[PDB]
Design a binder for this molecule. Structure first.
Ligand code: 4BW
Ligand code: 4BW
Ligand code: CA
Ligand code: CA
Ligand code: CA
Ligand code: CA
Lengths: 237, 237
């Protein structure tokens, strides 16, 4: 073990077709709502497995304490940790003590590590899918999270990076990128999710294009140790 | 300022529609055909801009000595100190002295390894296009080189990474990625180039799906200080 402490904020993912909440992403904060980066910047190589586990337990315990009945999304620590089976029971144990279905837990793989050689996140994704977890590719269209991931394995969901979503209602290039990626997603039976939606104009274009799942300040900012309600402008039109 | 010396190999790019050679990529080799990895291993921060400039001039001089009449494709090294604006003169002087038309020189931009700045390699790409150079995004669909690049700037050509190409006649996920990227490249009016083609089966599929420009061992391996001829089996049907 116990070097430093932190907690979670939660940000809803909204199904714009049914206007209900698909789930919440768990986002780490310091005890006074300090930033995620200011917490993760204290995570080094020696306490990576401890911090990984504590994030998982902390997100599961808080979501359950707050009464989350939809999905809980947890970023998988990008550091390609090994023996994917080692300390997966620490996540299985936590979900059992809070009676939280494995099937309601989605791990988001945000590949952005030091070495561009680690395709064996495929081993981890296929293992986690075998236990019943949902899976997502995070930050698709940025960093390392690219087509190279889709080529070798497919997750339930792909979170399109907010760089690709910003101002898309009037950016012809991003429009074409998204149009052709959605058909790719459809061909791969993968569900899209647009992240970082900030304005109604982006929302309205994404929804016409066929995206149902969306996340962003437009719907709700992350809520410190709380499960935010979603913007009235969208939930009543 | 020459701590060591090297030279070049050249590998043809074939336009399979017109059945003629589009150009040659210049690939650095050791003086005894040592690997490009072995030559770039000796590049540190101190001799970065020096090595770079030597690469471009060496490639132009050799190409001109060997009698190249088509395009010459040069890799723009990532971490190319990211401040070119004035230091393109050495490339412009070399092209003029060896009477090599600048419009037949293509630069291949493999990555944006200055991610603290956003428009960084966009700044360079637009500058070299403004001079009349050809440009290409290299290793598309692998590594850090992907859709995030296409969203903010467009080159004349996008070379699709051979990881996405490998065994594509057999791999239905890769067939879908490529079908939908090809239509995206069409929408953006970017000419696709398939890299690393190794067999006929791959070539025939890529050809049938509308790729014209291709490169790889199936056509010819890189030629040490030479301009290799292209395999007769593809040009004899
Ligand atoms: N400009 C903008 N930003 C938005 C919007 N909606 C959400 N954001 C923010 O984007 C980030 C998405 O999280 P990420 O997973 O892509 O990066 C995350 C994630 O990669 C990483 N992280 C890694 N492991 C984590 C972990 N166990 N728990 C929480 N965060 C973790 O911390 C990074 C910091 O994210 P954050 O909390 O500051 O901001 C959120 C979120 O508040 C939006 O609409 N507009
Ligand atoms: N397995 C396989 N490899 C192939 C095939 N066809 C070509 N290759 C090779 O793939 C590499 C494509 O070059 P790249 O730009 O994608 O990576 C290049 C490039 O990023 C960099 N580099 C090489 N020459 C450079 C140069 N002159 N200037 C700046 N950077 C250079 O080093 C890497 C290795 O060059 P290489 O000679 O060993 O291999 C070539 C090439 O010889 C193929 O069909 N199968
Ligand atoms: Ca995430
Ligand atoms: Ca993300
Ligand atoms: Ca290249
Ligand atoms: Ca390449």
């Amino acid at each position: 073990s116990l070097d430093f402490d932190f907690t979670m904020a939660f940000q809803p993912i909204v199904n714009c077709r049914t206007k209900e909440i698909f789930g919440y992403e768990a986002l780490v904060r310091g005890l006074n709502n300090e930033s995620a980066y200011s917490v993760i910047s204290r995570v080094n190589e020696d306490n990576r497995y401890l911090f990984d586990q504590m994030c998982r337990v902390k997100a599961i315990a808080l979501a359950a304490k707050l009464g989350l009945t939809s999905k809980l999304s947890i970023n998988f620590l990008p550091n390609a940790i090994y023996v994917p089976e080692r300390c997966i029971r620490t996540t299985l144990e936590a979900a059992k003590r809070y009676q939280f279905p494995i099937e309601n837990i989605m791990f988001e793989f945000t590949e952005a590590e030091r070495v561009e050689d680690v395709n064996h996140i495929k081993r981890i994704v296929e293992y986690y899918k075998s236990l019943g977890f949902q899976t997502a590719i995070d930050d698709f269209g940025s960093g390392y999270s690219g087509l190279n991931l889709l080529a070798d394995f497919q997750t339930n969901i792909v979170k399109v990076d907010m760089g690709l979503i910003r101002n898309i209602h009037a950016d012809q290039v991003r429009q074409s990128i998204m149009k052709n990626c959605l058909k790719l997603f459809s061909d791969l039976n993968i569900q899209p999710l647009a992240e970082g939606v900030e304005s109604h104009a982006e929302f309205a274009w994404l929804k016409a294009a066929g995206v149902e799942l969306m996340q962003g300040y437009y719907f709700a900012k992350p809520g410190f140790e709380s499960l935010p309600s979603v913007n009235p402008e969208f939930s009543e039109a």
